[PDB]
Predict the 3D structure of the following.
Amino acid sequence: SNRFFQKFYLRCGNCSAIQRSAQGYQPIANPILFKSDEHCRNYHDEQRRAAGYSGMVVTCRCHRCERVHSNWKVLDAQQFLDAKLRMTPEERAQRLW
Amino acid sequence: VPRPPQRIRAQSEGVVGRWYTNYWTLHSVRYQCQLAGVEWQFGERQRPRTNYDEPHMYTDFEETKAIRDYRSRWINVNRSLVGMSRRMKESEEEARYL
Amino acid sequence: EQVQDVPTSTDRKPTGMHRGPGKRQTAPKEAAQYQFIKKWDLQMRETWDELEPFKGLPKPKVQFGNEAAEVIWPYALLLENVIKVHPYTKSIYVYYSQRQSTPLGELAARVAKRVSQAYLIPITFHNSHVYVEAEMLLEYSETPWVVVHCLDGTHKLIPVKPQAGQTVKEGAEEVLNGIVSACNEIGSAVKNPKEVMRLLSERPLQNQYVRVNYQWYGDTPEERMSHLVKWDYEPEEVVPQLRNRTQHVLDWMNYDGNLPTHNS
Amino acid sequence: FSTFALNPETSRAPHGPPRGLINRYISMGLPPWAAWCNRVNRHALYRMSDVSPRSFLPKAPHEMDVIWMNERVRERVRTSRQVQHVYRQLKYPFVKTGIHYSDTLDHW
Amino acid sequence: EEIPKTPHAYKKLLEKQSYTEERWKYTIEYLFRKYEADPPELQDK
Amino acid sequence: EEFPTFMEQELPERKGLENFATNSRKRGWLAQWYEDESRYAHPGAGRRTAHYIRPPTDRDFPATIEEYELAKHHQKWHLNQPGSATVLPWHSLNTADMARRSAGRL
Amino acid sequence: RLKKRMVGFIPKVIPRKIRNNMVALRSEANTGHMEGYIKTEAERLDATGRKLQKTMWDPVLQRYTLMKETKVRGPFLTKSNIARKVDFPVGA
Amino acid sequence: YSEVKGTCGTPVLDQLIGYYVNIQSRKMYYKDFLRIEHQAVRWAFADIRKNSEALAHGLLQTGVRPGDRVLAIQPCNCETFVLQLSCAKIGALLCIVPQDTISADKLRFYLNEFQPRHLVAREWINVPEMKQGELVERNMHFWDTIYNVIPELGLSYPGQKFQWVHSQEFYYLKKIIITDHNMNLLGVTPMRKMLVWGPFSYYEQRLRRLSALLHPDDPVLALEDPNPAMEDKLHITYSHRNCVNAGFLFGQLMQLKAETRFGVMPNHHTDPIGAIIAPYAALTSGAVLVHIHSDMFTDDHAINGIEKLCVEEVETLVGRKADFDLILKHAGNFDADQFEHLRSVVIFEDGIEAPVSEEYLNKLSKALSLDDVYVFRGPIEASYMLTWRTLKKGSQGMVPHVEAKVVGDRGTSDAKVLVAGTRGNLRLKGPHVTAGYYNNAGLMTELIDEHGFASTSREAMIDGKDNITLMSAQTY
Amino acid sequence: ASQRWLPLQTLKPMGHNWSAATRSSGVRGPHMQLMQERLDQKGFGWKRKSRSLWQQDVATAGFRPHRYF
Amino acid sequence: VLPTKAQEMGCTLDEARRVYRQAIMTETPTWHRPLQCPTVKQEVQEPRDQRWPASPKW
Amino acid sequence: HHNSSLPYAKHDTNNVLAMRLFPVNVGVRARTEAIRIRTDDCLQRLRDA
Ligand SMILES: [Zn+2]
């Protein structure tokens, strides 16, 4: 349930391929027949993604090594430019997209 | 370079070392280059989209749900109405019996 | 599920010496213990079944090379092997012999049986037009073949030809680039498309039998559709219908002589 | 909040800014318990937007003894049973007897 | 890296960790030990 | 006089586009664009995906089982209507935004 | 407040409240209409083992249709009020 | 894309039916309007004005009130036209059921579906039937159909003709207008005849008063449906605007000027040709409608039906293709010079049947000496006209003032036009195309979005040039 | 002028969703509480679902017997 | 299997035993991963109290 | 008694002449708003004549 959009820049651990994976708009569980557990843990969980995947294992499939794992280090987008701007123009074709 | 969230203050300390990462310094300089006429070489904010995205002026779903749910009920009353005058006929000749 | 006969109690000494409601009866951590333990004891009696969830799915056509269907596939695996074919291909069949005489014949059947297992069923799950089926023939046929059909009713053969030196771990990758090549080539060499644009948009789902162990995707059918949701950042559609300003097209550059100079 | 069965993820609100009352408080960052406020004063939506948490430490920062990593004694406002009285109470964390083996000093 | 605050929120985390760590469970070769040779109904006795 | 250059203007609310912006009865300023460019679906969209910005599948038909059995049940939950294939939610939010003129002139 | 059951003029009997005295004559044409009707003493007493029936203007259809009796509490157009399809004696 | 549209430069009629009868009964009073030989009726526009204003008053006295219905089982008559005029002047929904098949069971249906205040039916109905595999006419005794339906008429007691409800089964039914040509001098006595002559009032013909209140878009017809879009559309309802323009569209393309003796093959008063497209074409744009032999199914009168169009100087004949084999099988007997007064023929094809292949039209002109053959294609919703394709110049422009877009199911007024190769819903638009359809539940309508497009609920696929092909509802 | 033709009115087979005698019926605003929001199918049920809430605000729909309400 | 798999990574056989088993998650009664892959065909939602033409309420 | 629609007595309710001629398909509050837009035109047709 993320009302707002946000795109992370996940860095794999196997190939360090900085791929970006966004988070769309997934609507709130219905309030009409409210359910206190499914809501208040939808919200509290939403701060934990909004703060750069704080307390969650990230599970997205790589683009370089085509496989899905849980090894991603979520890069704040000024730690990403720290990395992107500091790669020779060829390895940007290797690790970035 | 993304938009910092709401909880982060909106402050561009100006053109300084690595100013182009300050999202507000970047998109403000990017705007004076318009009023000045300088040619912005770098790319524009690419608003990302999904497979299942819908356009803005979408095709609404309620006025088609209720225009449909009535056909359902008028396709049913149409069925359940066969021989209704014959049916209600014997409704009386049984009530007139009691 | 055959293991639901959990004894409504447990050995654990009840904490709370005094007395009260809720004592000495099973706990949802203990109810999962006995469920697992008495699941293993069936799994030794072999009576334990895994088609307990997949009860609505039409049970696939059993066949001796078609064991690829009865396997419960991990949804995080059918996400990795994302193979796509030209949409106008209605089916794929991969036949191969049982026992292969020549040493290079056993090489190919290894590739076929591999591609019969590795790459065929993801194509079904991902493309859902194709009716992927594999059958093991029984004779010393030292060469397997693949019958790539198409929507127009046409079809081709793909003689499974792996190189002697290569492994089978790439012999299929070759065959893959030997099928997905044909599928587009067949779909490009089709006749008039108006008909197949109807059958394709009429062809029911062929991949219904496929048994996908949705692992950590069990939250809501939203994430069960996670392989169809396809993020597309930097999307590009640069073809605007520009509407120019015909009336008073000039007159923006001809007004407000700012603060008229010495002459006026 | 939308009513369809299968709502595949998407970039933006597919059907306009999310309707409903609880979507009104999520559209502004608040948590879904704002739906149960009787007064939502400018301090209230400050109080409950968790700008700075109303949550403290049992002893001083200097005299603190038991290792409270990142915790406070957060007060949980409960609403009572059948007749809804609102009362609050201070909920602590659970301190365990940490009986470890730090192999630096080769002893528990 | 993330603690689960609910059993079924853990029994999903066991599914994630069963994939990354013990990956040989999810090979096209381990999903087919049952079938590396003849379907059992055609072998001798 | 506070906007030195044309700072792009967002189209009005969907409710406005229904009634004024695109409705030729008022000669709304989009009554030219709506008929020219908007009211045409994507050149690849079938019948079900006529409203997606681009058809989310390589085939109009339902994609997976739960999108199908849901539509295999819906098309019979509603007596078999022509367009009833497209699954719709069985609950009216009764919102004013999803309200367009149900009866009126033309 | 307490005083949940009033005591001034507790009426002897009371027509509206009696095991099935008020009945929703819902329409047999499954248009969802209903016309609440209190069974008179002609049917208050079990003169009718049969479930009451009447002919009443069905304001939706604007036609006189059957009204089969039914409890007044309940959804009046359930998945039970669907009529099995039939090909009419019209058409080719 | 998946949109076709016809030109707009043609004028669109809009007023009531009863108005275009006036200003034709002034501009052309004595000019013939319809001639028939099977009843010997040479009607001038003067007649239908006088014979409808005196028939609408003939139903007011017999109980028909504006909202009510009225049923017609007339076989291919003339008096089944003045019914439409009368039932338009009082708003009563005239319903024309196909007589070519009837039984007490199909009648126990229309009496329950339409619930008519009046039932206009004959004693003898010429119903076709196949003997030894061959079609032969069987004079059906329709009288026995009624009495089975109404066992009340036999059980006669000295009070029953003044009884309130004549048949407690069908309380809807109040009179049964028998229409059987009769040869006795002294007609039926006023006990059993409706007064249809004279000034029925004193101070104002109370039709033109009630003719003020009903609107050019409310029903006057209910033509039964051969193949229904889906289980609901048991009948199609045409209003005033839908029928009157369905003539002035056709009356435009055939350029039927005054002095035009154009015929219509019989057995079409059921489908829109004989009901709206044929007569109301002869009405708006001054013309002559020469009906042909009472029926046209069996071979024996197809030979006769030609001599009818040999003396009556007919200039074109409209009718479905199933009528044009009977003309074809016996174009050999008559000499070529018997179709010298002919110029063209019109074949109204239903939207679903098949493209009548230009080889077959070549048979027709080779038998009937025709300048051209026109083929009007379209559903019954659109009154059998969306694409008209001539024989010589087969190019088929959409009829003027029509649209047809195929849209996706989701929205209604925003449902986006499809991509011209895919089946979606069909949305028609135009004067002649109707939006309402009768049903067991009563008068009903279909969506008319806020752009004028009326859903027809018949999924179709539009192709390259004006070529709308219908399809059946998908059921996956 | 342009001879274009359009009908007089749009007939939609849609049914009104506000019946004067039905309680929570109506067209609510885009941010009003949708019909029976938080109620969960019970009379004043949004009160009964308050103890179920994880944590409420400090000023949260407390006790208020309708006195001169 | 791992012999042939190690040649696919282009590495040594012993090295792959830490790419195909990064840790040996043995199994207990107390620690089973879900025994039955949850049901794939979920039961179809319905309007509330078997109401049929849609439902006004939740 | 216990009816809801007493026969048309003398009451100036909606255009019952046009309540008969109209599709029952449309709901009520969308019909009484459409028998008027029919009548609103029948008033213009009458004024123009
Ligand atoms: Zn990677």
Observations:
- The pocket of zinc ion is lined by residues A 12, 14-15, 17, 62, 64-65 (CB under 6 Å).
